[PDB]
Amino acid sequence: SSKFGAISSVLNDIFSRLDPPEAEVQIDRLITGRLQSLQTYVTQQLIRAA
Amino acid sequence: SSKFGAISSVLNDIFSRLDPPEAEVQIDRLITGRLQSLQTYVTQQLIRAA
Amino acid sequence: VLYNLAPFFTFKCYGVSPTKLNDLCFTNVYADSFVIRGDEVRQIAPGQTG
Numbered sequence: 827s828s829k830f831g832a833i834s835s836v837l838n839d840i841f842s843r844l845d846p847p848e849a850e851v852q853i854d855r856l857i858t859g860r861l862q863s864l865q866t867y868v869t870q871q872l873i874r875a876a
Numbered sequence: 877s878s879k880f881g882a883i884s885s886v887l888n889d890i891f892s893r894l895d896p897p898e899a900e901v902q903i904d905r906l907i908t909g910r911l912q913s914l915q916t917y918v919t920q921q922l923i924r925a926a
Numbered sequence: 927v928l929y930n931l932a933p934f935f936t937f938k939c940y941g942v943s944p945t946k947l948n949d950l951c952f953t954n955v956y957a958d959s960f961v962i963r964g965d966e967v968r969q970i971a972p973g974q975t976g
Contacts, residue, residue: 846973847940854881858909865916872923883941893950894943 830859880909936967 829835832855833844840853879885882902890899890906937944962969969976 845971847971849973851881858880862912869919872920876923876926893941893946895945898943 830856832856878909878913880905882906940972 827835832840832852834840837853840856841849844852877885882890882905884890885906887903887906890902894902942950966976968974
């Protein structure tokens with residue numbers, strides 16, 4: 827639900843109210859952040875599995 | 877090979893096709909991604925060494 | 927020889943820059959031309975509807 831520095835947390839509104847040349851770099855901020863938050867969850871499980 | 881949102885994956889093409897005031901944000905996306913890919917590699921070696 | 931007219935009011939480029947145009951090496955080029963009114967010049971951009 828967090829925006830992670832973007833303008834919205836839903837993907838459908840990203841492709842609605844802004845130019846198509848900016849939509850590539852705007853949604854690319856969100857996928858890196860969600861991949862970062864997924865990288866934080868796994869590296870806590872490696873500690874817990876030890 | 878990952879582009880991380882940049883227009884190319886080779887650093888000799890960013891500087892040879894566009895000005896210096898614009899490559900400062902294009903390459904900053906590449907550097908902060910390649911530096912993240914190296915921090916994930918070392919933090920997995922500490923798990924294997926333990 | 928392109929820099930001959932003073933009111934070249936649109937010369938900004940997307941993937942390249944005017945300074946680096948003389949040091950590149952293009953695979954192939956095409957030149958499309960048409961005549962439009964002055965209000966529709968800004969209507970030519972990637973994704974810019976009008």
